Amino acid sequence: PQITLWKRPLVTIRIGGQLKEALLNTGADDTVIEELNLPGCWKPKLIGGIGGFIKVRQYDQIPVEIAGHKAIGTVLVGPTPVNIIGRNLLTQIGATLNF
Amino acid sequence: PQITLWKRPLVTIRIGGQLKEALLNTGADDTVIEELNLPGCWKPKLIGGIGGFIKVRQYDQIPVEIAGHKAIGTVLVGPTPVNIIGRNLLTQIGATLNF
Numbered sequence: 001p002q003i004t005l006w007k008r009p010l011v012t013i014r015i016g017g018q019l020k021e022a023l024l025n026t027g028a029d030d031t032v033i034e035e036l037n038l039p040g041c042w043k044p045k046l047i048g049g050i051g052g053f054i055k056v057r058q059y060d061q062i063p064v065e066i067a068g069h070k071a072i073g074t075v076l077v078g079p080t081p082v083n084i085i086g087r088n089l090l091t092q093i094g095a096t097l098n099f
Numbered sequence: 100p101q102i103t104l105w106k107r108p109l110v111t112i113r114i115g116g117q118l119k120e121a122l123l124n125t126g127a128d129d130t131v132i133e134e135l136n137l138p139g140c141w142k143p144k145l146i147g148g149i150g151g152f153i154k155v156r157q158y159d160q161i162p163v164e165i166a167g168h169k170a171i172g173t174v175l176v177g178p179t180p181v182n183i184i185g186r187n188l189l190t191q192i193g194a195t196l197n198f
């Protein structure tokens with residue numbers, strides 16, 4: 001679809017067998033999801049931005065569907081206000097910025 | 100232009116008659132630039148990111164040229180790790196996300 005930027009670009013995703021809303025975020029290298037008990041081997045990571053850093057659990061090769069488009073990759077799990085879909089998954093769905 | 104997301108969507112902007120590099124950021128409500136000089140009064144504001152909240156200077160109705168495209172809007176100045184063009188100016192240049 002085409003997603004305008006008048007409001008936050010929130011879409012539905014499916015991850016770990018749960019449906020969630022997430023922000024399509026061209027300013028995020030990685031994908032960060034709210035606290036969720038995903039199965040799998042996870043390892044520690046710190047990620048940063050405005051305000052500093054938070055500790056997250058990194059999971060690899062996690063299947064994620066974004067608005068009906070399948071992706072598979074790394075998801076970081078931690079205490080975020082908004083689920084964030086980053087470029088690692090946005091490229092897999094062929095998302096572009098256009099103007 | 101159409102911009103893919105294999106690399107960070109960094110572009111050159113012109114602001115207060117000087118050139119800066121910044122990230123086209125659909126995950127940002129607002130436009131935030133590292134410490135730099137702009138004319139006019141500013142208002143103190145707080146904004147939030149992944150790591151917490153920072154204090155910024157809010158400048159209104161600032162002309163900014165983004166990849167050749169003219170916008171006139173609010174620019175926040177403060178200790179962001181990456182200069183970011185957020186939705187307040189992306190909507191002005193008619194940017195959308197597409198997949």
Ligand SMILES: CCCC[C@H](CC(=O)[C@H](CCCC)NC(=O)[C@@H](NC(=O)[C@@H](NC(C)=O)[C@@H](C)O)[C@@H](C)CC)C(=O)N[C@@H](CCC(N)=O)C(=O)N[C@@H](CCCNC(=N)N)C(N)=O
Pocket residue numbers: 025027028029030031032047048049050080081082084086124126127128129130131145146147148149179180181183185
């Ligand atoms: C969880 C909040 C949304 C997330 C985005 C993330 C973002 O824009 C930044 C942009 C680059 C760094 C400055 N990206 C990030 O912070 C991401 N960082 C990165 O991609 C990289 N790290 C760094 C240091 O660049 C890699 C190397 O890890 C991080 C999510 C890990 C993948 C962000 O910080 N948005 C802010 C930007 C500032 C702004 N004012 O626009 C925002 O919209 N803030 C709202 C928050 C509203 C919350 N309040 C509420 N809803 N009631 C606001 N107006 O303050």
